[PDB]
Design a protein around this ligand. Structure first.
Ligand SMILES: Nc1ncnc2c1ncn2[C@@H]1O[C@H](CSCC[C@H](N)C(=O)O)[C@@H](O)[C@H]1O
Lengths: 265, 265
């Protein structure tokens, strides 16, 4: 008589919270989606082993078009869980699924898990200083998305940092790298010419957050644009004006150029 | 030779991740701090029993002044864990501790966990629309801090949501309630007259995130200012203009009045 939205966390099957695991273990049916993000350190099998249940994976269409026909029916007579990478309600449209649950007479509960949205704290940048976030989407056909560029501009003007979620084509197994994101931004800059993103812009890259050894790198676009940051997923950040302590961490932990220590107040 | 920064999550002892628990269990020494925030749904005793290790609590002074004399020495020759509420490094002062570790010749790794910063996704508000964050501090003596009011103004002005962390006297375990925060903001408004926070302002209250029964309420200040949102902790959010999908979730899940579907969209 219930539906649980349970996050699996950032990188592997152990990133699920103890709360989420104990609840999942007792559910009658377990569903999941793996298109909203990439968990690079585990497999469906390892997750199934940990929870001790068979997991039915749903596609974007299964969820967005038939969540109420595939999941909710069973939730009316059983305890059902719906697993997702990271936190189920961060940078996804899953929140609306709670309304479908309500209209189907199914109570729903949310179990949080580590999210990339807060994990960026590991870059040393103050979390409260992050402004509006955006997603760098792959251009398609004659369409070239550029809204993420304006987000950076607006935040930077306020001295805020910008978190850039990178695109993902789960079914095609394509995961945008920070390198590709940088290349796209430089092209948008050539078009709008707002001096927002150039070869001299300081950026931070975080790859495989959640693993024990994620790649954390800070430096100028000209220097990092061709650097190997390892396997996906990747996230790109364009810092605003830095506090001295943020610069110190970027230098000491993320290998940034020591010159950024000399902040221009 | 290794120091592990492990997040305890949102509310109780089960909000730690499976990864964090297993690592904490195999650590020779386990330290923890409860000054950046508290774990309202559990106790030190319950956390200790779960980890199966003695936990030495450290004060703000122990950490800020003597982290390198209390924690690092043992981490130099043993596996040491440093537990913190929420997600490690979201609190601004945590990051610097990794630099101290580096200088002492000690390796450090971060084990993430759910943070209120990302858990607000349960309010139905799109995470990318959250702007700069702020903390509402209790005024005292002749000191009346109001920077948090300006943060709301700047965010709402750009159509962004404002997450307001509420003050907490960790040592005395005193939590500021959403009600007190609303009263304070009305007080600041009466002072600055910026038309930023009034009886007609739409707000969202999230209490006990992480719990299976959090209180999620949305409505106008005039109606929520004296409402009972349950036990701590409380988080207050002043959303910017709403996407219809956000408004529908607030109405269906947070009990918001239908009026927001026309006034705040
Ligand atoms: N472990 C990780 N490391 C780096 N980026 C990550 C990441 N997990 C997610 N992302 C980033 O976020 C995008 C998915 S957005 C969905 C995020 C998810 N609900 C969460 O709470 O984390 C990815 O394409 C990537 O750019």
């Amino acid at each position: 008589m219930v539906l649980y939205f349970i996050g699996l966390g950032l990188y592997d099957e152990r990133d699920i919270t103890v709360k989420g695991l104990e609840i999942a273990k007792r559910c009658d049916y377990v569903f999941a989606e793996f298109y909203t993000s990439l968990m690079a350190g585990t497999t469906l099998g390892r997750i199934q082993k940990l929870i001790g249940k068979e997991i039915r994976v749903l596609s974007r269409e299964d969820v967005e078009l038939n969540f109420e026909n595939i999941v909710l029916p069973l939730a009316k007579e059983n305890d059902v869980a719906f697993l997702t990478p990271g936190d189920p309600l961060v940078a996804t449209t899953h929140a609306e699924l709670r309304i479908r649950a309500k209209r189907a007479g199914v109570e729903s509960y949310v179990i949080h898990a580590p999210s990339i949205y807060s994990a960026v704290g590991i870059t040393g940048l103050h979390i409260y200083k992050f402004g509006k976030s955006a997603t760098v989407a792959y251009p398609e056909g004659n369409w070239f998305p550029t809204s993420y560029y304006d987000v950076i501009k607006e935040n930077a003007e306020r001295g805020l940092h910008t978190l850039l979620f990178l695109d993902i084509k789960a079914e095609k197994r394509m995961y945008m790298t920070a390198n590709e994101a940088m290349e796209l931004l430089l092209k948008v800059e050539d078009m709008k010419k707002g001096g927002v993103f150039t070869d001299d812009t300081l950026v931070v890259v975080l790859a495989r957050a959640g693993s024990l050894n994620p790649t954390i790198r800070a430096g100028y676009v000209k220097d990092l644009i061709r650097e190997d940051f390892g396997d996906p997923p990747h996230i790109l950040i364009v810092p605003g004006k830095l506090h001295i302590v943020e610069a110190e961490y970027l230098v000491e932990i993320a290998g940034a150029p020591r010159e950024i220590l000399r902040v221009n107040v």
